[PDB]
Design a binder for this molecule. Structure first.
Ligand SMILES: CCCCCCCCCCCCCCCCCC(=O)OC[C@H](COP(=O)([O-])OCC(O)COP(=O)([O-])OC[C@@H](COC(=O)CCCCCCCCCCCCCCCCC)OC(=O)CCCCCCCCCCCCCCCCC)OC(=O)CCCCCCCCCCCCCCCCC
Ligand SMILES: CCCCCCCCCCCCCCCCCC(=O)OC[C@H](COP(=O)([O-])OCC[N+](C)(C)C)OC(=O)CCCCCCCCCCCCCCCCC
Ligand SMILES: CCCCCCCCCCC[C@H](O)CC(=O)SCCNC(=O)CCNC(=O)[C@H](O)C(C)(C)COP(=O)(O)O
Ligand code: SF4
Ligand code: SF4
Ligand code: SF4
Ligand code: SF4
Ligand code: FES
Ligand SMILES: [K+]
Ligand SMILES: [Zn+2]
Lengths: 94, 96, 54, 209, 176, 115, 115, 129, 162, 263
């Protein structure tokens, strides 16, 4: 939003088309006068067949499972070794 | 409506007034004990009492969602006028 | 530096202990703002670095 | 889960961690007491105090564990036990992208061998824990206050330590530098006994006693 | 998947090596930052003219507390103390008394801003939308006793700040 | 094998020009330290049960890049790094012989953590 | 059993030694403490303010508690060598600005409900 | 039990000198424990399952500028959880606090017979359910 | 859309600059072993070439469906860490693009009203919403006993809570 | 003696003959949710919330009044039992008025606590709730009858414990109101315990009305002095002042009742 001559100066001193889009904001933003929303209901808003016992996350948690207490096999690992990642197919060398 | 204490300072809506022998009043010197002029005591009595023709009425407080949660007040006591505790405005039977 | 990256960890601490999961739309908001939050720290993780640098 | 409210489960991981839980148990039967994996796939190793430095060494060294990252040092204090403070470690294995929890118990007086040799990250985590809780560990390089105020007496995180503290300070002109005094709040901490008087979880309820 | 960040071995070609030598002897990448900085100088500054000009806001902004009242005039607060129970810094102190009529609201409603956190939790904890986080960020003062309000000024604040929040909750009542 | 690894990824450690031989001599040293341990001990059996495959797998595969994919322990450099790292474990396991029963039962109340 | 593992002081004798070199470091510390730290108190009241704190803890019979305290003694000691603390930090030992605490029964009765 | 230069230091634990609470708050503080009583309007007896440690309520004065309950004792809101009473007293001894113990008021095991609500001679029959 | 044109502004200012580089490259280095031995995380490890990132190794929330790259350093010095920080910002923008174009419909909080407050419209109309809102905003949801160490990929490292 | 052997959730229980299911489960530490029944008063069985399934049960048996026989296993956490709790409880929260911010029981209401434990997270009522006109039985006990759950707890207290038979119910159907049918002075010298007896805000302490909330009050154990029986009580102190006198729990002193003078 300035003179064309300086726009060339800024576009050539920085070597890039800054005028296409700038740091400052303009009328491309959404207006702050939005119409009233109509926010949706949830999955459990069903009028029937919504008993809490079938969706009770808190009550369906068991105490920490115990495997050994003070009172031919194979050697295992907590998880399989982490898969070695592949180079970025988009661009592998910066 | 705001009254005035005998010491010359306006009384608050809760009725609190600083005693004349009190020492902590001096905070009001060169300052003001400002009092909300719109007394909730005097801001609800003059509102008209409605005359709905039904036994039980849902009072919302106006504005729907913006008002207080809906409360089902009862109007059967002829001597007394029904009211919602959330709002305090009056309700009444149609003179029966 | 990271406003809602932190309670994202705290939120993940509670509801995962609670055996409860957030709705799928909410998680997308969390990761979207977490990445915006990731931008928030990195902005002065580098510039304030340059401030002390010169 | 066809129901979208509750959190799903990873039974494959839960059993897999449980298999490694018993794995460590045979490896070091002297030190581990009981090994438990919680419902939300968190397998914890419970080791004896005196064997703190070997188990951490084993997890850092062994190929099948390879846990070389001291995530965090915590010593959660429970007043109802004889040795209250239970010191909890936190390790991450990069090669097996899994987390392990090894923990001990230790009273206010028993010293622990410092794990700085097995984990250089324990160093500053050690300076903090003795500050907040007051459990001294042995032969630490420079074990000394690094959190609380210079000369602040008492470990603030202890159960017996009030949240408001014991002393407060204020600048005084008659001596021309700040000075401390017993704490006297303008507003006290209004305790909120909001715990529900009704049982919340039948699963975790203790047996009758 | 990962992307390697820092390794690019420079070509030892005569053209390429004289590029680096020219870059070294004749400051070229050095003047590149110097040169672009010129281009950014000619950009008009993004500075507002305070207080003649004030920054953008949103209807769901948290500012100074203001106790509102019903259209009739009765103050919405009904002393449920939920705001006190939720207030993460206990900035609210509540006392109640049934006075004479349908107006038992508070013996005491003191909100302590220098203790308060401006989390806004009191606003959505209120079942009657009595206590709200006002849109006024501009309530600074010179004395410490000023930065706390009594129950009366909360009413005066809600009285003085009334049009803004009435429209703000009007636009935001469906979101929350 | 192939051309020498110019960089070993992780910084600080140095790429070794003799991967297979280093694995051979280290794994034999692993078994050497495993010798002076009772065979009933879990640690001896466990590490022996993993090093036997580990030692025969390098002795069979002559290509280091294939050996990277087969063992799946990453590059050889961290594999030998851990092999000597595990060497310290086996040597100094001898001073904390764990095979005997535990020291003592916990004093009850430290477990059961709902209070 | 009730038998416990000591850290450094097996009994009173070695613990009595450890409280002794605390005095050895402290006694030659107070003079240049006042000198370096810009303090306006003399050495004389500096010396006995190290004194009475020994009788402030001159009742414990457990060697561990003496040992648990010997570490803190040199901690505040070391904190004073390298000027880490500030003037107020060491002034906190010099109880100087607080009101005197009542001692006789008449005084606390006249002060308030303090028991 | 673990022989590492063990010495028979069986004297009562005294951690007060190390925790270093002020002299007024280690001697002049009657520490009392009980099991909390269930709120009568509630029916929540499960809250009566834990031993609780308390203190003595000291002066609570009103602030001049507003009117508060400013306190001078740091140990005002401090309550502690104990599974059994022996652990609660054990903490008192090590922290050298003057301890007081109450007992667990277990409910009487009353006999309820709904058939007795309609008897032929017993007065227990109910005039209105 | 406008931001990607700004990391290039910083990188033009600093990365190619010799003055920035001289003060920065090879100034402060960590080896592989002492990196994770000292408990470092995030950029500290990534700059040192350590192949670890919490988002990829241990995905959380909906981070599994998003696709992005993690910059991995080669020297473990200050220049590498700053370069990875710059590249993480670019990769962050790519995550924003995928997140922006993949926003799904539905609610905003768990439908379980015992863990999340009910909607205001329901709280003023329905009993269950009001009584839950009263108790949720006076007691809080009862969390079962236990312990957890959830840790996310913080912009610095592995910020977590026990 | 007989000592019939029963089970709860599989666990074996040694219990005395003639006891009910609720007492049998209370032995192991199971507090079945209940509204109508109280320990010191006769069993009524009107709440129907105590309904808990037993082993191989075609029909759910109410735990309030159910003499448990030999070899009975109580299915405390059965899906049928949990369905029973949800069904009757939402029926309770059908005509209950939206008064939780106003009702003084908020934060200490028995009904409120059960809803978070044994209750659904949403309602299905889409009609007009019932409203009951308030009464007056004393300038010490606020009467808001629209919140009544018709558990007849106050009815039993007046007849059995208080000894004055003036309180009761009236009508039928949904309009089955609880009252006196005539303006009456509830004169019982221990009538103050009716506030504690009522699980909801139907009966509220007029002097304590709109004065404090449960979580802020600090409970201190003490004993009354107005009487020589020494009925131990609890004082509710918020910010260094006394508002409410809570009767304590002592079998051989006062059970759980106190006089209005003490209260
Ligand atoms: C070399 C410098 C030569 C002098 C300055 C020329 C200049 O930049 O003029 C602005 C002019 C336009 O700038 P712009 O940012 O595109 O304006 C956008 C809006 O129209 C701008 O909208 P606006 O509303 O700002 O337009 C009005 C503006 C317009 O202001 C001007 O045109 C500046 C010149 C004074 C009038 O004047 C004012 O705002 C009044 C305040 C003036 C302050 C004092 C200026 C003193 C200038 C030097 C005087 C001699 C010493 O600059 C050019 O066109 C560049 C010409 C370069 C010539 C170099 C010759 C060698
Ligand atoms: C109002 C004022 C207007 C006039 C301002 C003049 C100074 C600034 C000019 C623009 C900035 C310079 C150009 C730039 O940044 O990028 C373009 C380019 C950027 O080059 P580069 O760093 O991409 O490398 C170029 C070489 N190749 C393509 C082979 C890689 O600038 C130059 O090449 C110019 C080099 C300048 C050297 C400075 C020292 C000598 C100066 C003359 C003798 C005294
Ligand atoms: C202002 C300057 C900086 C700030 C300076 C002030 C702060 C630092 C103070 C450092 C000293 C510390 O308080 C006390 C300590 O070191 S140890 C106490 C040991 N207490 C017992 O073991 C009980 C029995 N005590 C006795 O029997 C004797 O009294 C005793 C052994 C003490 C000496 O007499 P004898 O050798 O027996
Ligand atoms: S934002 Fe509201 S609820 Fe939160 S502290 Fe401030 S006043 Fe209290
Ligand atoms: S402001 Fe709202 S939440 Fe606070 S007491 Fe008043 S009505 Fe209740
Ligand atoms: S009695 Fe309980 S459910 Fe009814 S209004 Fe009062 S607090 Fe709410
Ligand atoms: S008034 Fe209260 S005690 Fe009486 S029947 Fe109704 S809910 Fe039960
Ligand atoms: S206990 Fe069976 S209904 Fe109240
Ligand atoms: K009641
Ligand atoms: Zn109303």
């Amino acid at each position: 939003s300035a003179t064309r001559v300086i726009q060339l100066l800024r576009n050539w001193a920085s070597g890039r088309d800054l005028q296409a889009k700038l740091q400052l904001r303009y009328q491309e933003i959404s207006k702050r006068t939005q119409p009233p929303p109509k926010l949706p209901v949830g999955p459990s808003h069903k009028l029937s067949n919504n008993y809490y016992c079938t969706r009770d996350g808190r009550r369906e948690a068991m105490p920490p499972s115990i495997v050994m207490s003070s009172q031919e096999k194979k050697a295992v690992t907590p998880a399989p070794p982490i898969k070695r990642w592949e180079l970025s197919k988009d661009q592998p060398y910066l | 409506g705001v009254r005035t204490s005998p010491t010359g300072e306006k009384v608050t809506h809760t009725g609190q007034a600083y005693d004349d022998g009190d020492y902590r009043r001096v905070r009001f010197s060169d300052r003001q004990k400002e009092v909300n002029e719109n007394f909730a005591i005097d801001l609800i009595a003059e509102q008209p009492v409605s005359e709905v023709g039904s036994r039980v009425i849902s009072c919302d407080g106006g504005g729907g969602a913006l008002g207080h949660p809906r409360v089902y007040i009862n109007l059967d006591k002829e001597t007394k006028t029904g009211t919602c505790g959330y709002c305090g405005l009056q309700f009444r039977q149609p003179h029966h | 530096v990271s406003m809602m990256c932190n309670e994202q960890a705290y939120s993940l601490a509670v509801e995962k202990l609670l055996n409860i999961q957030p709705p799928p739309r909410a998680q997308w908001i969390r990761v979207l703002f977490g990445e915006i939050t990731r931008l928030l720290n990195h902005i002065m993780a580098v510039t304030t670095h340059a401030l002390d640098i010169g | 889960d066809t129901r979208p409210t509750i959190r799903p489960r990873n039974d494959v991981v839960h059993k897999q961690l449980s298999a490694f839980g018993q794995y460590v148990a045979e490896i070091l039967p002297k030190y581990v007491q009981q090994v438990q994996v919680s419902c939300f796939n968190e397998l914890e190793i419970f080791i004896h105090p005196d064997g703190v430095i070997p188990v951490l060494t084993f997890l850092r060294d062994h190929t099948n564990a390879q846990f070389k990252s001291l995530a965090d040092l915590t010593a959660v204090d429970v007043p109802t036990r004889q040795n209250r403070f239970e010191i909890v470690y936190n390790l991450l294995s990069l090669r097996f992208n899994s987390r392990i929890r090894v923990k001990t118990y230790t009273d206010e007086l028993t010293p622990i061998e410092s794990s700085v040799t097995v984990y250089k990250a324990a160093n500053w985590y050690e300076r903090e824990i003795w500050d907040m809780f007051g459990v001294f560990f042995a032969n630490h390089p420079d074990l000394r206050r690094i959190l609380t105020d210079y000369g602040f007496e008492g470990h603030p995180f202890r159960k017996d330590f009030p949240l408001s503290g014991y002393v407060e300070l204020r600048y005084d002109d008659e001596v021309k530098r700040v000075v401390a005094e017993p704490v006297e709040l303008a507003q006290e901490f209004r305790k909120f006994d909001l715990n529900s008087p009704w049982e919340a979880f039948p699963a975790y309820r203790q047996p009758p006693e | 998947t990962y992307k390697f960040v820092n390794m690019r071995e420079p070509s030892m070609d005569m053209k390429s090596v004289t590029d680096r030598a020219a870059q070294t002897l004749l400051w070229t990448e050095l003047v590149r930052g110097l040169g672009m900085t010129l281009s950014y100088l000619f950009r008009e500054p993004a500075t507002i003219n305070y207080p003649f000009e004030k920054g953008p806001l949103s209807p769901r902004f948290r500012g100074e507390h203001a106790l509102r009242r019903y259209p009739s005039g009765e103050e919405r607060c009904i002393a449920c103390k939920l705001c006190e129970a939720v207030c993460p810094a206990q900035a609210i102190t509540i006392e109640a008394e049934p006075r004479a009529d349908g107006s038992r609201r508070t013996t005491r409603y003191d909100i302590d801003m220098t203790k308060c956190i401006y989390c806004g939790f009191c606003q959505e904890a209120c079942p009657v939308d009595a206590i709200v986080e006002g849109p006024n960020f501009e309530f600074s003062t010179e004395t410490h006793e000023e930065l706390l309000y009594n129950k009366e000024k909360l009413l005066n604040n809600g009285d003085k700040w009334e049009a803004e929040i009435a429209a703000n909750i009007q636009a935001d009542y469906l979101y929350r | 094998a192939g051309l020498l690894k110019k960089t070993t990824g992780l910084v600080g450690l140095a790429v070794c020009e003799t991967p297979h031989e280093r694995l051979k001599i280290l794994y034999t040293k692993i078994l050497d330290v495993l010798g002076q341990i009772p065979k009933n001990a879990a640690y001896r059996k466990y590490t022996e049960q993993i090093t036997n495959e580990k030692l025969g797998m390098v002795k069979a595969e002559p290509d280091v890049k294939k050996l990277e994919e087969q063992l799946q322990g990453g590059q050889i450099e961290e594999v030998i790094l851990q092999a000597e790292n595990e060497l310290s474990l086996a040597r100094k396991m001898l001073r904390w012989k764990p095979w005997e029963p535990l020291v003592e039962e916990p004093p009850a109340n430290q477990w059961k953590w709902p209070i | 059993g009730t038998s416990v593992k000591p850290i450094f002081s097996r009994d009173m004798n070695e613990a009595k030694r450890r409280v002794r070199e605390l005095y050895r470091a402290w006694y030659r510390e107070v003079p240049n403490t006042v000198h370096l730290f810009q303090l306006d108190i003399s050495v004389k009241q500096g010396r006995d303010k190290v004194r009475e704190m020994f009788m402030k803890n001159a009742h414990v019979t457990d060697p561990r508690v003496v040992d648990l305290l010997v570490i803190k003694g040199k901690m505040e000691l070391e904190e004073t060598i390298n000027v880490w603390k500030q003037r107020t930090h060491i002034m906190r030992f010099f109880h100087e600005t607080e009101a005197p605490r009542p001692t006789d029964f008449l005084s606390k009765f006249y002060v308030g409900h303090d028991p | 039990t673990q022989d590492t230069q063990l010495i028979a230091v069986d004297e009562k634990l005294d951690i007060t000198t190390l925790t270093g609470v002020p002299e007024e708050h280690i001697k002049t503080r009657k520490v009392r424990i009980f099991v909390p009583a269930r709120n009568n309007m509630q029916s929540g007896v499960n809250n009566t399952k834990k031993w609780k440690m308390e203190f003595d309520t000291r002066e609570r004065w009103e602030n001049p500028l507003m009117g508060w309950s400013s306190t001078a004792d740091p140990l005002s809101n401090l309550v502690l959880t104990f599974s059994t009473k022996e652990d609660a007293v054990a903490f008192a001894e090590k922290n050298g606090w003057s301890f007081d113990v109450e007992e667990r008021k277990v409910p009487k095991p009353k006999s309820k017979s709904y058939g007795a609500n309609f008897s032929w001679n017993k007065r227990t029959r109910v005039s209105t359910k | 859309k406008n931001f990607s044109f700004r990391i290039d502004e910083l990188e033009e200012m600093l990365t190619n600059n010799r003055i920035w580089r001289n003060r920065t490259v090879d100034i402060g280095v960590v080896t592989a072993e002492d990196a994770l031995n000292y408990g470092f995380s995030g950029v500290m490890l990534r700059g040192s070439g350590i192949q670890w990132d919490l988002r990829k190794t241990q995905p959380y929330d909906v981070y599994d469906q998003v696709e992005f790259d993690v910059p991995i350093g080669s020297r473990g010095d200050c220049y590498d860490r700053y370069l990875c920080r710059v590249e993480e910002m670019r990769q962050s923008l790519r995550i924003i693009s995928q997140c922006l174009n993949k926003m799904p419909p539905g609610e905003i909080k768990v439908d379980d009203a015992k863990v999340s407050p009910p909607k205001r419209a329901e709280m003023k109309t329905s009993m269950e919403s009001l009584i839950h809102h009263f108790k949720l905003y006076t007691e809080g949801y009862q969390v079962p006993p236990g312990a957890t160490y959830t840790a996310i990929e913080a912009p610095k490292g592995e910020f977590g809570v026990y | 003696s007989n000592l019939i052997e029963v089970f709860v959730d599989g666990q074996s229980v040694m219990v005395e003959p003639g006891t009910t299911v609720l007492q049998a489960c209370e032995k192991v530490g199971m507090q079945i949710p209940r509204f109508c029944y109280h320990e010191r008063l006769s069993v009524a069985g009107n709440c129907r919330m105590c309904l808990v399934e037993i082993e191989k049960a075609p029909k759910v048996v109410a735990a309030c009044a159910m003499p448990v026989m030999k070899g009975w296993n109580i299915l405390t956490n059965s899906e049928k039992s949990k369905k029973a709790r949800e069904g009757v409880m939402e029926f309770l929260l059908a005509n209950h008025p939206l008064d939780c911010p106003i009702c003084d029981q908020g934060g200490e209401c028995d009904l409120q606590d059960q809803s978070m434990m044994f209750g659904s997270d949403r309602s299905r009522f889409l009609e007009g709730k019932r409203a009951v006109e308030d009464k007056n039985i004393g300038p010490l006990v606020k009467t808001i009858m629209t919140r009544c759950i018709q558990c007849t707890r106050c009815i039993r207290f007046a007849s059995e414990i208080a000894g004055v038979d003036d309180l009761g119910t009236t009508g039928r159907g949904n309009d089955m109101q609880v009252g006196t049918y005539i303006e009456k002075m509830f004169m019982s010298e221990l009538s103050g315990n009716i506030i504690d007896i009522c699980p909801v805000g139907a009966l509220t302490s007029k002097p304590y009305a709109f004065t404090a909330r449960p979580w802020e009050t600090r409970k201190t154990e003490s004993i009354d002095v107005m009487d020589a029986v020494g009925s131990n009580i609890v004082v509710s102190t918020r910010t260094g002042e006394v508002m409410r006198i809570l009767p304590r729990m002592h079998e051989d002193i006062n059970e759980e009742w106190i006089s209005d003078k003490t209260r």
